[PDB]
């Protein structure tokens, strides 16, 4: 029970804002690979 | 080289048919999310 | 048929042809891209697997089969289709997760009630670590308590060749105390919650890489056969539309001729 | 006689097609020079003045009609051919009938999407 697990967050969600944090550190010669990662474009079906 | 845009419509083919069904499948959908959307902007 | 019945017709295929030889083109550079991105992903994917592998863990049952929305792939769809039915009648309560609309398409007519999710736009963006992330956040904290599962994807091997696989998911956060996993005690119940849940983003991450690759490397061949085959219609049409052309100008005349002489 | 006798006639013309080649072949026999398809100049004329005959009589002239259901026959579905254009010109509405169809087991094989008629008089029925 870490103070995120208690709020109800994984360790899913942990780490993908961890893994966005290193890639918004980069600089501008290895951002370039951050649009080819890093999606969001899988949805849900509801209904 | 010369310009055919809407060719497939207009050969009343299988293809044809198909896109038109197609199209409209995809926007019956959109209707029915619309108007449920619509629905609960009523109130 | 009739000269503007053929016209119609030849240009119809026409954009046809040029419609499948351009996306042919797009799933070649698709596929490319995609086969790169397979490379650091499998040594990833594997590495994952390796746990599993080194033991004999035995044991509700959860079977995602993975595939896309997009058609023109070939057997893509239906080989997963077909071997989640399989696996469904073989098992011993179960449940279902569709990833890529046309797997809910197949299924939905028997297995309606079996479904638990599906998720769409699958197929139009490579797939990422993200994407395998909000399938697992889908899951975990969406109500179901799977026992034991399996995911079903094609596994990439060559341009023209793919197989249908299973790997399991003995993601049951209590089937990792047992028999051969007694080596690995020692490890609080946090922890073991965390492993699990990245463990579980590994092997739809995994699945989620070799099956795009495996429907890039479809869709440029279903576009290709598509095209050659659009050709050979035309090749075909031209023929009949030229016979047709030159026909019509002799009736024409002949009647124009039969009308003068008859004066 | 009966649509100008106050009475009500119906008239089946089996087949138009038929007719307009006997009227080719007199025509021609006739030394009249041959025209579209070797048909007659006039072959509209031969349809559009038969079928006008088809009429519904106010009361003054007895109430009465005469309704005409021509047939024509295509050749491989061509309703733009010459006989059936002008036909099809000439009639309130048109029920196509198709071999994909009749083969399909649509029998009675009518395109329903094609096929019209006009409108209806209020009355066809009511709870029809």
């Given at each position: 029970?870490?103070?995120?697990?208690?709020?109800?967050?994984?360790?899913?969600?942990?780490?993908?804002?961890?893994?966005?944090?290193?890639?918004?550190?980069?600089?501008?010669?290895?951002?370039?690979?951050?649009?080819?990662?890093?999606?969001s474009?899988?949805?849900?079906?509801?209904? | 080289?010369?310009?055919?845009?809407?060719?497939?419509?207009?050969?009343?083919?299988?293809?044809?048919?198909?896109?038109?069904?197609?199209?409209?499948?995809y926007?019956?959908?959109?209707?029915?999310?619309?108007?449920?959307?619509?629905?609960?902007?009523?109130? | 048929?009739?000269?503007?019945?053929?016209?119609?017709?030849?240009?119809?295929?026409?954009?046809?042809?040029?419609?499948?030889?351009?996306?042919?083109?797009?799933?070649?550079?698709?596929?490319?891209?995609?086969?790169?991105?397979?490379?650091?992903?499998?040594?990833?994917?594997?590495?994952?697997?390796?746990?599993?592998?080194?033991?004999?863990?035995?044991?509700?049952?959860?079977?995602?089969?993975?595939?896309?929305?997009?058609?023109?792939?070939?057997?893509?769809?239906?080989?997963?289709?077909?071997?989640?039915?399989?696996?469904?009648?073989?098992?011993?309560?179960?449940?279902?997760?569709?990833?890529?609309?046309?797997?809910?398409?197949?299924?939905?007519?028997?297995?309606?009630?079996?479904?638990?999710?599906?998720?769409?736009?699958?197929?139009?963006?490579?797939?990422?670590?993200?994407?395998?992330?909000?399938?697992?956040?889908?899951?975990?904290?969406?109500?179901?308590?799977?026992?034991?599962?399996?995911?079903?994807?094609?596994?990439?091997?060559?341009?023209?060749?793919?197989?249908?696989?299973?790997?399991?998911?003995?993601?049951?956060?209590?089937?990792?105390?047992?028999?051969?996993?007694?080596?690995?005690?020692?490890?609080?119940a946090d922890?073991?919650?965390?492993?699990?849940?990245?463990?579980?983003?590994?092997?739809?991450?995994?699945?989620?890489?070799?099956?795009?690759?495996?429907?890039?490397?479809?869709?440029?061949?279903?576009?290709?056969?598509?095209?050659?085959?659009?050709?050979?219609?035309?090749?075909?049409?031209?023929?009949?539309?030229?016979?047709?052309?030159?026909?019509?100008?002799?009736?024409?005349?002949?009647?124009?001729?039969s009308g003068?002489?008859?004066? | 006689?009966?649509?100008?006798?106050?009475?009500?006639?119906?008239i089946?013309?089996?087949?138009?097609?038929?007719?307009?080649?006997?009227?080719?072949?007199m025509?021609?026999?006739?030394?009249?020079?041959?025209?579209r398809?070797?048909?007659?100049?006039?072959?509209?004329?031969?349809?559009?003045?038969?079928?006008?005959?088809?009429?519904?009589?106010?009361?003054?002239?007895?109430?009465?009609?005469?309704?005409?259901?021509?047939?024509?026959?295509?050749?491989?579905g061509?309703?733009?051919?010459?006989?059936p254009?002008?036909?099809?010109?000439?009639?309130?509405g048109?029920?196509?009938?198709?071999?994909?169809?009749?083969?399909?087991?649509?029998?009675?094989?009518?395109?329903?999407?094609?096929?019209?008629?006009?409108?209806?008089?209020?009355?066809?029925?009511?709870?029809?």
């Amino acid at each position: 029970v870490a103070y995120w697990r208690q709020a109800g967050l994984s360790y899913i969600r942990y780490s993908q804002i961890c893994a966005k944090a290193v890639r918004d550190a980069l600089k501008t010669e290895f951002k370039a690979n951050a649009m080819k990662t890093s999606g969001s474009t899988i949805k849900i079906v509801k209904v | 080289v010369r310009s055919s845009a809407g060719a497939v419509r207009d050969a009343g083919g299988a293809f044809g048919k198909r896109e038109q069904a197609e199209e409209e499948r995809y926007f019956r959908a959109r209707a029915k999310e619309q108007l449920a959307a619509l629905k609960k902007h009523h109130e | 048929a009739t000269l503007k019945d053929i016209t119609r017709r030849l240009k119809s295929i026409k954009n046809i042809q040029k419609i499948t030889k351009s996306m042919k083109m797009v799933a070649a550079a698709k596929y490319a891209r995609a086969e790169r991105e397979l490379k650091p992903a499998r040594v990833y994917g594997v590495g994952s697997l390796a746990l599993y592998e080194k033991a004999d863990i035995k044991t509700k049952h959860l079977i995602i089969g993975v595939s896309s929305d997009r058609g023109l792939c070939g057997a893509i769809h239906s080989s997963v289709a077909k071997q989640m039915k399989s696996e469904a009648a073989n098992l011993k309560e179960v449940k279902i997760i569709g990833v890529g609309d046309k797997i809910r398409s197949i299924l939905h007519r028997t297995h309606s009630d079996q479904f638990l999710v599906t998720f769409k736009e699958v197929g139009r963006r490579p797939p990422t670590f993200g994407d395998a992330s909000v399938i697992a956040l889908e899951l975990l904290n969406s109500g179901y308590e799977f026992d034991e599962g399996s995911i079903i994807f094609n596994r990439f091997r060559s341009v023209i060749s793919y197989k249908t696989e299973e790997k399991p998911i003995f993601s049951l956060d209590t089937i990792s105390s047992a028999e051969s996993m007694s080596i690995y005690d020692d490890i609080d119940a946090d922890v073991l919650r965390n492993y699990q849940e990245y463990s579980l983003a590994n092997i739809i991450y995994y699945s989620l890489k070799e099956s795009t690759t495996s429907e890039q490397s479809a869709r440029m061949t279903a576009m290709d056969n598509a095209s050659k085959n659009a050709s050979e219609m035309i090749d075909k049409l031209t023929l009949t539309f030229n016979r047709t052309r030159q026909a019509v100008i002799t009736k024409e005349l002949i009647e124009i001729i039969s009308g003068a002489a008859a004066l | 006689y009966f649509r100008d006798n106050g009475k009500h006639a119906l008239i089946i013309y089996d087949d138009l097609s038929k007719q307009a080649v006997a009227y080719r072949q007199m025509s021609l026999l006739l030394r009249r020079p041959p025209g579209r398809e070797a048909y007659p100049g006039d072959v509209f004329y031969l349809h559009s003045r038969l079928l006008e005959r088809a009429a519904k009589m106010n009361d003054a002239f007895g109430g009465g009609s005469l309704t005409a259901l021509p047939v024509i026959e295509t050749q491989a579905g061509d309703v733009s051919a010459y006989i059936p254009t002008n036909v099809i010109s000439i009639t309130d509405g048109q029920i196509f009938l198709e071999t994909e169809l009749f083969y399909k087991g649509i029998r009675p094989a009518i395109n329903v999407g094609l096929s019209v008629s006009r409108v209806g008089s209020a009355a066809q029925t009511r709870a029809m």
